[PDB]
Short mmCIF file of C-alpha atoms and ligand atoms in Angstrom, two decimals:
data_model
loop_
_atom_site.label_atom_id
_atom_site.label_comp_id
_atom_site.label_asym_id
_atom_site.label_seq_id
_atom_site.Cartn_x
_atom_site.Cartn_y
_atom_site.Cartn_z
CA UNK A 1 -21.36 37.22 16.81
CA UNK A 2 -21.07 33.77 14.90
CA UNK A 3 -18.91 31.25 16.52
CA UNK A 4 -17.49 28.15 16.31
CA UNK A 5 -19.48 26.01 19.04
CA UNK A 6 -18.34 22.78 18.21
CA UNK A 7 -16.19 20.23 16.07
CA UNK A 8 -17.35 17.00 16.00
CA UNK A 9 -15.79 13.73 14.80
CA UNK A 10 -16.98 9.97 13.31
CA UNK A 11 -14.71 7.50 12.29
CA UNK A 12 -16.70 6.43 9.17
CA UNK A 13 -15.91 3.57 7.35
CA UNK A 14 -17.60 1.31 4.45
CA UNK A 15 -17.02 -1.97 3.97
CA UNK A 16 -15.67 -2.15 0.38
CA UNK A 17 -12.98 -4.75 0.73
CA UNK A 18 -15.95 -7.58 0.29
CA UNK A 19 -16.44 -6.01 -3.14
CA UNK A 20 -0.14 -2.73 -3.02
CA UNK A 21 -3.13 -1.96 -0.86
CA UNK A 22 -4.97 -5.22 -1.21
CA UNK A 23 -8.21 -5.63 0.72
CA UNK A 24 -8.96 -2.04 1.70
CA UNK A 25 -12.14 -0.68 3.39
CA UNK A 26 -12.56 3.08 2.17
CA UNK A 27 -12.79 4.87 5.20
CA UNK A 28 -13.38 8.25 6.87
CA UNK A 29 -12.25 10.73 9.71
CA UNK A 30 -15.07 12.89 9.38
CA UNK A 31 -15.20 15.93 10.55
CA UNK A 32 -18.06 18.83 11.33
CA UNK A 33 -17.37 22.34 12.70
CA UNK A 34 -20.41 23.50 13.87
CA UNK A 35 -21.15 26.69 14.85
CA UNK A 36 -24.09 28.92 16.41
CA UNK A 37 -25.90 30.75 13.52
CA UNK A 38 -28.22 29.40 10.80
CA UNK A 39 -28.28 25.28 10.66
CA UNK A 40 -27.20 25.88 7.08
CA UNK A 41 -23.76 27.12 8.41
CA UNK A 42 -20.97 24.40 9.17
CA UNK A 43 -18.08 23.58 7.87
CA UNK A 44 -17.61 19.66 6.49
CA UNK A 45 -14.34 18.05 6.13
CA UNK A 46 -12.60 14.36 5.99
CA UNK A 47 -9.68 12.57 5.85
CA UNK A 48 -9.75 9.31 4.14
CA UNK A 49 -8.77 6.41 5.04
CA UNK A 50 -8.38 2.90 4.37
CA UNK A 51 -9.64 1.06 7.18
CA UNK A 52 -7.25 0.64 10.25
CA UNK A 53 -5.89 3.30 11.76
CA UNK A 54 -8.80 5.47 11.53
CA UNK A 55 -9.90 5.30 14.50
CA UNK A 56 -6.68 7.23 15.59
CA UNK A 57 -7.20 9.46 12.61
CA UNK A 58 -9.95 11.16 13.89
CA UNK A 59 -8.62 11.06 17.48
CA UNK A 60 -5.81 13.38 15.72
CA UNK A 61 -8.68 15.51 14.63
CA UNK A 62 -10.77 15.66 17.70
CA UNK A 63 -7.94 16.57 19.61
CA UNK A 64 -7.98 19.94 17.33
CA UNK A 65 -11.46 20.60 19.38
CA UNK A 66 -9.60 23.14 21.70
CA UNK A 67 -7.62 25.17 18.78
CA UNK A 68 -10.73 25.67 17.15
CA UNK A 69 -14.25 25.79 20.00
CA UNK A 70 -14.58 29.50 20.65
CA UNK A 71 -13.49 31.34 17.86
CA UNK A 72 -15.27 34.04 15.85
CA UNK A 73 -16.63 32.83 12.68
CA UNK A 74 -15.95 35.39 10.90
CA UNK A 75 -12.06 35.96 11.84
CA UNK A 76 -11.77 32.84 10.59
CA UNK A 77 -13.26 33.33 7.49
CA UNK A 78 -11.48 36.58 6.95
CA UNK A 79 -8.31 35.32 7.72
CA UNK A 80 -7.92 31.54 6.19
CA UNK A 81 -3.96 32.09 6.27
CA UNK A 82 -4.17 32.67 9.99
CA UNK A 83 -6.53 30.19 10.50
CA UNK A 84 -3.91 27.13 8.82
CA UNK A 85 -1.00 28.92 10.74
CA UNK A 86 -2.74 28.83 14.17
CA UNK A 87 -2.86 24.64 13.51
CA UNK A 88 0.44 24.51 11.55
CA UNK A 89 2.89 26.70 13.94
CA UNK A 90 1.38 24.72 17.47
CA UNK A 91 4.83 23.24 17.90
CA UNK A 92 3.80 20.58 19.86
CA UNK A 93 1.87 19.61 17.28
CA UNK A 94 4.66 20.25 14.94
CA UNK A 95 6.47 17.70 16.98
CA UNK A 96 4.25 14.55 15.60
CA UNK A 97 5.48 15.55 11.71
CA UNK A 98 6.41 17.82 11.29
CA UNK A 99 3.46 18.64 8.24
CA UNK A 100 3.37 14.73 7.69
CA UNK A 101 1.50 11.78 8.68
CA UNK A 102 -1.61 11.46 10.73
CA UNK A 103 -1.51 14.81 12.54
CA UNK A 104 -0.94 16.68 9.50
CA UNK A 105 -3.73 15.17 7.46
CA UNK A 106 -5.87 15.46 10.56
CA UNK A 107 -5.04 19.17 10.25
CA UNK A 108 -5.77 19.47 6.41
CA UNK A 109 -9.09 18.23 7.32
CA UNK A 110 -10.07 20.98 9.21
CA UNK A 111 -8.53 23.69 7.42
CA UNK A 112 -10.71 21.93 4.93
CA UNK A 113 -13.96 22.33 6.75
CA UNK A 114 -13.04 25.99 7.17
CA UNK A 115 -12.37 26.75 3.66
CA UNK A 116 -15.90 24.46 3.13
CA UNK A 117 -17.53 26.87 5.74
CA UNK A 118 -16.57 30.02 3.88
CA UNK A 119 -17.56 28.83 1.15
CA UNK A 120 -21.12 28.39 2.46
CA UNK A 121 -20.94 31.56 4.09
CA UNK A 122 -20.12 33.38 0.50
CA UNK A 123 -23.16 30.93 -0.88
CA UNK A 124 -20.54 30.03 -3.21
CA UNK A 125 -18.59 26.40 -4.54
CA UNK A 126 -15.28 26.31 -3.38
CA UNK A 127 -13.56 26.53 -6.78
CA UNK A 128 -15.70 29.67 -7.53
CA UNK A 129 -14.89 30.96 -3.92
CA UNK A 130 -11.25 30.53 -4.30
CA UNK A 131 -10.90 32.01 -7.99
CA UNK A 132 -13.12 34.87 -7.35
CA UNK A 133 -10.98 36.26 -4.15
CA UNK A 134 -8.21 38.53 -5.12
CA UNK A 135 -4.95 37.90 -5.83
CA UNK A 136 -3.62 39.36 -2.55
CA UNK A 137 -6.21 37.44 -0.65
CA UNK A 138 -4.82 34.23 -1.99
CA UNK A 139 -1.48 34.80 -1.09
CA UNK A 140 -2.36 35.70 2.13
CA UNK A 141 -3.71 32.09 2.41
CA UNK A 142 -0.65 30.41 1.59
CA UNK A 143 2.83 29.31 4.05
CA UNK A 144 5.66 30.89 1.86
CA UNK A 145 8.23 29.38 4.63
CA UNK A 146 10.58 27.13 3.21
CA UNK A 147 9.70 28.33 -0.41
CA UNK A 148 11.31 31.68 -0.94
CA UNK A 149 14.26 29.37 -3.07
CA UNK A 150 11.12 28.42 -5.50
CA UNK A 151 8.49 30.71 -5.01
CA UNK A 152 8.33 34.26 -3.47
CA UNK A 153 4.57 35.93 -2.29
CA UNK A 154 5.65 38.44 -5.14
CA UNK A 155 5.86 35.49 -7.84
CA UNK A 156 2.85 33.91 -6.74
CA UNK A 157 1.36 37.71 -7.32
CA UNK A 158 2.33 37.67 -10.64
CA UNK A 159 1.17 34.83 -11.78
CA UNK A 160 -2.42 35.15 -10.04
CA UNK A 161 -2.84 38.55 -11.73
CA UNK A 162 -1.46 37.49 -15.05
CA UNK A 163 -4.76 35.64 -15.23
CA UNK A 164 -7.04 37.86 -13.17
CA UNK A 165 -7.96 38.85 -16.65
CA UNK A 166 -9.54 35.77 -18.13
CA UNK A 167 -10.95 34.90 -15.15
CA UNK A 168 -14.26 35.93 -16.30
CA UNK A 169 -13.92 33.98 -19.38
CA UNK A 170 -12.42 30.74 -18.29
CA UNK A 171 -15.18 30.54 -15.58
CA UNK A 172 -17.60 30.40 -18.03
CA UNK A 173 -16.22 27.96 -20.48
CA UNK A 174 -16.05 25.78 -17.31
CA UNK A 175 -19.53 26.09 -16.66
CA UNK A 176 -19.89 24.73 -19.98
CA UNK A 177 -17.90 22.59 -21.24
CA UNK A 178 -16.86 20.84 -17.75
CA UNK A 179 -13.38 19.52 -17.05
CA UNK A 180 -11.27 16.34 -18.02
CA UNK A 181 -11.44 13.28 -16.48
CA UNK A 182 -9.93 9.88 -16.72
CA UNK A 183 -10.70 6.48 -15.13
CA UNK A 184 -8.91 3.89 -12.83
CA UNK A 185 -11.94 1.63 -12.90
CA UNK A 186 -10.90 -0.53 -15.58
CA UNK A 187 -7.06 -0.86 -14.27
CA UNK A 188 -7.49 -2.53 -10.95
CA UNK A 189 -7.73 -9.65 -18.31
CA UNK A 190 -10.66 -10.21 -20.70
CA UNK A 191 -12.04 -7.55 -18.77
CA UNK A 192 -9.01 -5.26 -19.35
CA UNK A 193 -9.92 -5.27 -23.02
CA UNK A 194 -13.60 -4.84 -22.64
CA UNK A 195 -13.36 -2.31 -19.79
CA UNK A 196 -11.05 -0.36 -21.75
CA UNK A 197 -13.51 0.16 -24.58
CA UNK A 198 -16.55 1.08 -22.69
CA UNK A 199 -14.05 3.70 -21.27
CA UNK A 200 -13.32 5.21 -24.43
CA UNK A 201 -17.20 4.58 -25.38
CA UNK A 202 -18.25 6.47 -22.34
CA UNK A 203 -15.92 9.81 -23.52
CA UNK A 204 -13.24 9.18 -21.86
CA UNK A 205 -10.34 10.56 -23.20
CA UNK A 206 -7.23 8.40 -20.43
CA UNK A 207 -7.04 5.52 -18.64
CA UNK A 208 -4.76 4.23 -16.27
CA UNK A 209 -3.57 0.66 -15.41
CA UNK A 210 -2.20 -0.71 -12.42
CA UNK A 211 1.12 -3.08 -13.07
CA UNK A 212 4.26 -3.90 -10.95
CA UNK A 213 3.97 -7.44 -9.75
CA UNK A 214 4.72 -9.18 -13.22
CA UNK A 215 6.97 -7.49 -15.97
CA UNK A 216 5.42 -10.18 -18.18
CA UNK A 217 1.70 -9.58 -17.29
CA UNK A 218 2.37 -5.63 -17.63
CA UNK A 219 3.99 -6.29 -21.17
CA UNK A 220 0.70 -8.29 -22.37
CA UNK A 221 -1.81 -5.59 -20.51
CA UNK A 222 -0.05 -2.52 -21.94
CA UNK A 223 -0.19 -3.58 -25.51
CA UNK A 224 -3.67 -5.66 -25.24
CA UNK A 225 -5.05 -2.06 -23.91
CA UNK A 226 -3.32 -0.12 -26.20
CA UNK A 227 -4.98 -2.13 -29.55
CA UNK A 228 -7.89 -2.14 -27.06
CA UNK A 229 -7.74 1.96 -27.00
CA UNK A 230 -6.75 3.12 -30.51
CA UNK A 231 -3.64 5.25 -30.81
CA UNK A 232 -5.11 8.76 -29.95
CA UNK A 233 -6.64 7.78 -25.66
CA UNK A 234 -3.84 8.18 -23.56
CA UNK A 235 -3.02 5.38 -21.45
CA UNK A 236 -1.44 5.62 -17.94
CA UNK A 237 0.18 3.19 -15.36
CA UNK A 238 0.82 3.24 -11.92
CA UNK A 239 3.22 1.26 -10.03
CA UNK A 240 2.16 2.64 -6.00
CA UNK A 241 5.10 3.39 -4.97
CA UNK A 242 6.26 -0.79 -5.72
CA UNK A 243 9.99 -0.42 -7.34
CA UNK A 244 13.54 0.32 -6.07
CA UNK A 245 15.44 2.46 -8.80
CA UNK A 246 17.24 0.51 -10.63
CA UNK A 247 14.40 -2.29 -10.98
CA UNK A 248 11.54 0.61 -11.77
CA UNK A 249 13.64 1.33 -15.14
CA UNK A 250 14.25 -1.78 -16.29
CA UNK A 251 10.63 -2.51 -15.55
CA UNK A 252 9.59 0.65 -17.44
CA UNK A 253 11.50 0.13 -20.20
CA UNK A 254 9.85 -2.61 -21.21
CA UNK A 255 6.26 -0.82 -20.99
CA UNK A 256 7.41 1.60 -23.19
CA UNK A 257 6.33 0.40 -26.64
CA UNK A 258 2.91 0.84 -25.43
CA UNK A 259 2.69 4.49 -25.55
CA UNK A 260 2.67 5.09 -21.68
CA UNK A 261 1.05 8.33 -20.86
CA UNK A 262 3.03 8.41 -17.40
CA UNK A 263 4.14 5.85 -14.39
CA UNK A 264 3.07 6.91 -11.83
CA UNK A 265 4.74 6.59 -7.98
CA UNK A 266 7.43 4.34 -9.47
CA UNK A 267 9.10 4.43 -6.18
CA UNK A 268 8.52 6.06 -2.74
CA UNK A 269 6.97 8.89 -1.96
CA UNK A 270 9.88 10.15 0.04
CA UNK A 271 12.46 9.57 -2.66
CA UNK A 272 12.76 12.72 -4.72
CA UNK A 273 16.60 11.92 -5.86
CA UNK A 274 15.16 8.36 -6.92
CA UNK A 275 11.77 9.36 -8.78
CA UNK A 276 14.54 12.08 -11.05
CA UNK A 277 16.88 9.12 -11.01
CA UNK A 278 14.04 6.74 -12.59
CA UNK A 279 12.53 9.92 -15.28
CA UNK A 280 16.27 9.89 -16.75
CA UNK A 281 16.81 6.36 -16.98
CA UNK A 282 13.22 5.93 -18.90
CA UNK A 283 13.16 9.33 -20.80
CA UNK A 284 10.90 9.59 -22.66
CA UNK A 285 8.50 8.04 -20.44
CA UNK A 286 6.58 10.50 -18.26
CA UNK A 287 7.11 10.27 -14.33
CA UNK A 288 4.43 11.20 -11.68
CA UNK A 289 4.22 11.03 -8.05
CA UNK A 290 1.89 13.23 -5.61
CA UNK A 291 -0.97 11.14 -3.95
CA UNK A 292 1.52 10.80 -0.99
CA UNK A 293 3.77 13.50 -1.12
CA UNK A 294 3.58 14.93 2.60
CA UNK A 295 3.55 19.13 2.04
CA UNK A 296 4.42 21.50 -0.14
CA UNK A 297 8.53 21.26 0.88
CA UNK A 298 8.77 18.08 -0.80
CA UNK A 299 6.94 18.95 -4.03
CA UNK A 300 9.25 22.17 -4.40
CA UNK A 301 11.87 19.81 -4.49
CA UNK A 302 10.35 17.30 -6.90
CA UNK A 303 10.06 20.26 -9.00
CA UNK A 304 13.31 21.63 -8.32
CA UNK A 305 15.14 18.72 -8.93
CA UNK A 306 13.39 17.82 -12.25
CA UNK A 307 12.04 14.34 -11.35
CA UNK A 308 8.37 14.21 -12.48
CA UNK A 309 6.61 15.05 -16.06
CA UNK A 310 3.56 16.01 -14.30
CA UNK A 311 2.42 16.03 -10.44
CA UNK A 312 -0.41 14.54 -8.52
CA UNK A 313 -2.53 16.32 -5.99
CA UNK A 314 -5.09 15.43 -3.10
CA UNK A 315 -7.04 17.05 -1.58
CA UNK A 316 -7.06 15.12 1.92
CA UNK A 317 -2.87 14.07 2.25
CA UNK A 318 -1.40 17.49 2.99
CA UNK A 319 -2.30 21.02 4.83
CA UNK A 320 -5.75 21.81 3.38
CA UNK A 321 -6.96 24.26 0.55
CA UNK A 322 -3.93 26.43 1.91
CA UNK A 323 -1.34 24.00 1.37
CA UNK A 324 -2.75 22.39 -2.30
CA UNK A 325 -2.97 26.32 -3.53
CA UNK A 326 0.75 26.68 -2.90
CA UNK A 327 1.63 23.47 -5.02
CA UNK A 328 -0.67 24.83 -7.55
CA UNK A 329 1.69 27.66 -7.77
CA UNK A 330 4.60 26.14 -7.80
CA UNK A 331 3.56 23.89 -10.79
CA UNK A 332 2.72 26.35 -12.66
CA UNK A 333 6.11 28.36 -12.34
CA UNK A 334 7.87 25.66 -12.57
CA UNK A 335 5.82 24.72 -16.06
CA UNK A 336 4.43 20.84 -15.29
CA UNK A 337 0.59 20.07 -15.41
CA UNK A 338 -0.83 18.22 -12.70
CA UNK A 339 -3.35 15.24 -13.24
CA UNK A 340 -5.34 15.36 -9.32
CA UNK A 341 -5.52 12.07 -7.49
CA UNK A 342 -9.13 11.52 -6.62
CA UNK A 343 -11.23 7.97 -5.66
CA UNK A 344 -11.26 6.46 -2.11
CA UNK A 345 -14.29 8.24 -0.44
CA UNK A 346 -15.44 11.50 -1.19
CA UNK A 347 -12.03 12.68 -3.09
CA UNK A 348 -13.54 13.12 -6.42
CA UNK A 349 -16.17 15.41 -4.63
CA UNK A 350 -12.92 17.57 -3.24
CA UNK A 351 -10.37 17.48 -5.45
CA UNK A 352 -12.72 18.89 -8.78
CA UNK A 353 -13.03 22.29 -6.57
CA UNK A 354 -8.85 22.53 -6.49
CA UNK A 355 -8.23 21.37 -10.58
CA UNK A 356 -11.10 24.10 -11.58
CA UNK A 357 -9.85 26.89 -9.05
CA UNK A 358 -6.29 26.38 -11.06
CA UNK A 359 -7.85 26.68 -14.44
CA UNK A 360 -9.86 29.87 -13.57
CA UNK A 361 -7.18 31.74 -11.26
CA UNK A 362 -3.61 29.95 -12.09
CA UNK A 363 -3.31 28.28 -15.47
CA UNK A 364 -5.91 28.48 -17.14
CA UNK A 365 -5.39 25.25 -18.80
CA UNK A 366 -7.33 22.30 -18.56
CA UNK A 367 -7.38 20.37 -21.92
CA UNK A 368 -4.12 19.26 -21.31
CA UNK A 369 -4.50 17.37 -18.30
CA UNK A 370 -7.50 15.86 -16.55
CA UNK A 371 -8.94 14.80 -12.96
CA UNK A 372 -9.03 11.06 -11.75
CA UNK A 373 -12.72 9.57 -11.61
CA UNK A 374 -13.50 6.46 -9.81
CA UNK A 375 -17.21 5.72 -9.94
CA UNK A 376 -17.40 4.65 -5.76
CA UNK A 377 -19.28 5.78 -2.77
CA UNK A 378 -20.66 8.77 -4.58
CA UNK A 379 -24.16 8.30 -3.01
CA UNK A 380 -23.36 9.22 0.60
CA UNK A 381 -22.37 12.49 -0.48
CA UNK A 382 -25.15 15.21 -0.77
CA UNK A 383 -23.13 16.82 -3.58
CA UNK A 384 -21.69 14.07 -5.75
CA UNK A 385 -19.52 14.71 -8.91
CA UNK A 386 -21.31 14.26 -12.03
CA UNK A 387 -19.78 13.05 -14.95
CA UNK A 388 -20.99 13.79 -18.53
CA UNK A 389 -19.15 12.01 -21.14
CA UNK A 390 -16.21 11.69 -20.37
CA UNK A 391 -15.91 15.20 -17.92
CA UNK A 392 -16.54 16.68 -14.55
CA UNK A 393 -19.54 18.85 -14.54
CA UNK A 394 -18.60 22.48 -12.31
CA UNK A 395 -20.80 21.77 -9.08
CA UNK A 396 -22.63 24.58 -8.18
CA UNK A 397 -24.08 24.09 -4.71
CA UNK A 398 -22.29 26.35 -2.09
CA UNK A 399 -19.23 24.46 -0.56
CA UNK A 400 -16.46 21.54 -0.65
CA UNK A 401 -18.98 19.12 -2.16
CA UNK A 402 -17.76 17.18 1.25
CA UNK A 403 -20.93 17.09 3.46
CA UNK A 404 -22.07 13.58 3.68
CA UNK A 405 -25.61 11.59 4.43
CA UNK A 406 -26.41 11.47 7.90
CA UNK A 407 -27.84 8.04 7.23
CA UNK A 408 -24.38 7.05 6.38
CA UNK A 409 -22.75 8.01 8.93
CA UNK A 410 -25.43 6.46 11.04
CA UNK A 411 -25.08 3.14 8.91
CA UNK A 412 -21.34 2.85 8.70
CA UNK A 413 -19.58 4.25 11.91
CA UNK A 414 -17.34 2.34 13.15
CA UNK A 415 -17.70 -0.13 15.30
CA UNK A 416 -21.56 1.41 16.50
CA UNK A 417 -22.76 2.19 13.21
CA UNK A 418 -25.73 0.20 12.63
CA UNK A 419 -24.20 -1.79 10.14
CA UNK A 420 -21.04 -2.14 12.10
CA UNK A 421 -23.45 -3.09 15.25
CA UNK A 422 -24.89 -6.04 13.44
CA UNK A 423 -21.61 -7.06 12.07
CA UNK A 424 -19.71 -7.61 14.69
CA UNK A 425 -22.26 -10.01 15.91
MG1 MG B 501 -2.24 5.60 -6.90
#
């Protein structure tokens, strides 16, 4: 009998910052469930962060150790629903969110590393292993509590076997033809201009710029890029989560002229009343939010209440595969395309699995969106994306893409990596 022997934890972090989050050091809560049967078979997982704080990060995750240590492989493979529910209903856990903040990531991580682990187990990548299981299997997966106003199991049915059919087909024209992507690189101003045209030179088909502290600044940017881009790349802008609502439209409306693809997180995260409030006052500017948004509760309401264009996803912020597959669902019943967040460390490698499982299983549409690249970090990962022109290539080793170089670890843990040893002296 396979089992679970072990889940072990490394506050990982790289020190980027000497290269409205200024100075950030991508960082990781890394985390390995180990388990007694071929080498080959562990699940890898991570929550990134951005330098302090991580430490108690992946204290949130270590302390999962006893929910996990002991338990049969293969029950939790079977049973991936059960598995996120056993984390998700502890109600002393519950207590810390509830489904938000630190113990809630730290709990996406390793439903994660589980979903990673069956993967492996299927010799599979995840967005293969999560297309090619049956409709009723991915339902099973997913926490309808809370959603039954929005989205019943027997809707998400539907839709799943709607496109059971094409499944075949759309997997291949993945394998082919890759999926969408668009870069941040250029936004974080000579360089704005040149930046901006290597983009587009290297097939990239959006960009996205970063504005908020100057109206003035953002005014020259947007239309310098926009000359910079042609008429026919799409051109984004994100504000993190900077602007009250009243200020965010007036800002916005003067960004306009510039052909704005979407704003994204014009406000905060929290404010669903204020992002709909802000999407009305600068129609027809697209709205976005999503990198933050804590679960699935407060997307059904962004959807509900009409207040974004198109959505934002990541992989590491909310409940795991479990949780993402549910806000797949509900945007796509509720019709609004969703662009995944990606960067930091090791969320391009994640976050391509979920965008191609929705194109193959859910949507079926992929042309008219695309995931964020950022070209960072991608070395200490054993399966980095790969971009070609412009487009994620469909990984095709078995897994989450998430398993990391042991020499990194063992060069930036924090504070006894060897790197953190020296530095610190
Ligand atoms: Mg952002």
């Amino acid at each position: 009998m396979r089992t679970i022997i072990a889940l072990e934890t490394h506050d990982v972090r790289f020190p980027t910052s000497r290269e409205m989050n200024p100075d950030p050091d991508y960082s990781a809560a890394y985390v390995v469930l180990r388990t007694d049967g071929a080498e080959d078979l562990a699940g890898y997982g991570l929550v990134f962060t951005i330098g302090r704080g991580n430490d108690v990060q992946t204290a949130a995750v270590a302390a999962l150790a006893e929910h996990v240590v002991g338990l049969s492989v293969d029950k939790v493979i079977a049973d991936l629903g059960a598995f996120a529910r056993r984390l998700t209903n502890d109600s002393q856990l519950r207590w810390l969110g509830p489904e938000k903040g630190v113990m809630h990531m730290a709990i996406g991580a390793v439903i994660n590393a589980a979903w990673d682990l069956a993967a492996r187990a299927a010799n599979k990548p995840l967005w293969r292993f999560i297309a090619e299981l049956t409709p009723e299997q991915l339902v099973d997966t997913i926490d309808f509590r809370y959603l039954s106003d929005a989205l019943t199991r027997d809707e998400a049915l539907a839709i799943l076997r709607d496109a059971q059919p094409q499944r075949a087909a759309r997997t291949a024209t993945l394998i082919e033809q890759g999926y969408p992507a668009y870069t941040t690189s250029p936004g974080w101003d000579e360089k704005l201009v040149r930046l901006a045209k290597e983009a587009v030179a290297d097939g990239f088909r959006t960009i996205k710029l970063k504005v908020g502290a100057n109206v003035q600044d953002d005014i020259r940017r947007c239309r310098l890029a926009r000359a910079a881009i042609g008429p026919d790349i799409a051109m984004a802008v994100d504000a993190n989560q900077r602007w009250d609502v009243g200020p965010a439209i007036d800002w916005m409306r003067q960004l306009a002229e510039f052909d704005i693809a979407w704003i994204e997180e014009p406000t905060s995260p929290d404010d669903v009343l204020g992002h709909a409030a802000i999407r009305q006052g600068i129609t027809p500017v697209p709205v976005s939010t999503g990198e933050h948004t804590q679960n699935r509760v407060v997307f059904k309401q962004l959807l509900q209440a009409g207040a974004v264009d198109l959505i934002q996803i990541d992989a590491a912020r909310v409940g795991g595969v479990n949780e993402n597959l549910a806000i797949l669902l509900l945007a796509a019943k509720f019709g609004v395309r969703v662009f995944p967040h990606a960067g930091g460390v090791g969320l391009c490698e994640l976050v391509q699995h979920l965008a191609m499982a929705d194109f193959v299983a859910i949507t079926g549409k992929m042309e008219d969106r695309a995931i964020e690249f950022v070209d960072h970090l991608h070395q200490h990962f054993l399966d980095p994306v790969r971009i070609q022109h412009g487009r994620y290539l469909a990984p095709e080793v078995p897994g989450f893409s998430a398993e990391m170089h042991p020499a990194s670890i063992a060069e930036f843990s924090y504070p006894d990596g060897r790197f953190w040893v020296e530095d610190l002296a």
